[PDB]
Amino acid sequence: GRKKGLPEFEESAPDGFDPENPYKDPVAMVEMREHIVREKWIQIEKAKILREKVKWCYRVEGVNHYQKCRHLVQQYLDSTRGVGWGKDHRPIS
C-alpha cells in the first residue's frame, strides 16, 4: 500500500526524549534524529526560497537593485547564517 502522494510526516516532536540523557532511551532516538533532520531541511528550503526570491528580484531590479530589495537581502542572509551542515557557524537548534 501507498498514499500515492506527499509523504506526510508527524510535525509533533517525539515524546520521551531528554537532552541530558539522550542515550538512555534508544527507541526514541531515531525519530528525534529524523525530526531534527527534517527541520534542518525545512530551514534549507526556506533559504532556497529566499534565494529564488532574490533571483527573481535581480532581473526586475535593474541598475538600482539596492534601493527596493535591501530588506529581502537581510532576510536571505539571516537564513544562510543558520544553514544545515555548512561552514564553522553551526546553528544551535
Binding site: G1, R2, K4, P7, V27, V30
Partner: protein, 85 residues
C-alpha cells in the same frame, strides 16, 4: 489505456507501507535492546553456581550410605555386640 497510467499504480502497489515499516523498526529496536540486556545478564552467571553441592544430584551419598551402614565391613564396633537383644 496508455503505459504511464498503469505503470504509476503498478509502482505504487510495488512500494510498501511506510507506517508498517516505521512501526516494525521501532518494535525491532525495542525487543532487540531488551534481548541484548537479557544476554548481558546471562553472560554474568559464574561457572560454579552458588548452591552447587546443595543440589540433590551433587550429594549422591547422604541417601545411599544410610542403607549401607548395616552391611558387614561398615558397622560401628558397638553395633553387633548389643544387637543380640
Amino acid at each position: 489505456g496508455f503505459i504511464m497510467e498503469f505503470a504509476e499504480n503498478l509502482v505504487l502497489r510495488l512500494m510498501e507501507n511506510p507506517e508498517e515499516r516505521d512501526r516494525k523498526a521501532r518494535e525491532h529496536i525495542y525487543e532487540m535492546h531488551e534481548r541484548c540486556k537479557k544476554i548481558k545478564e546471562m553472560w554474568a552467571l559464574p561457572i560454579r553456581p552458588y548452591g552447587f553441592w546443595t543440589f540433590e544430584r551433587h550429594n549422591a551419598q547422604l541417601r545411599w550410605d544410610p542403607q549401607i551402614s548395616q552391611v558387614a565391613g561398615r558397622r560401628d564396633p558397638y553395633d553387633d555386640l548389643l544387637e543380640d537383644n
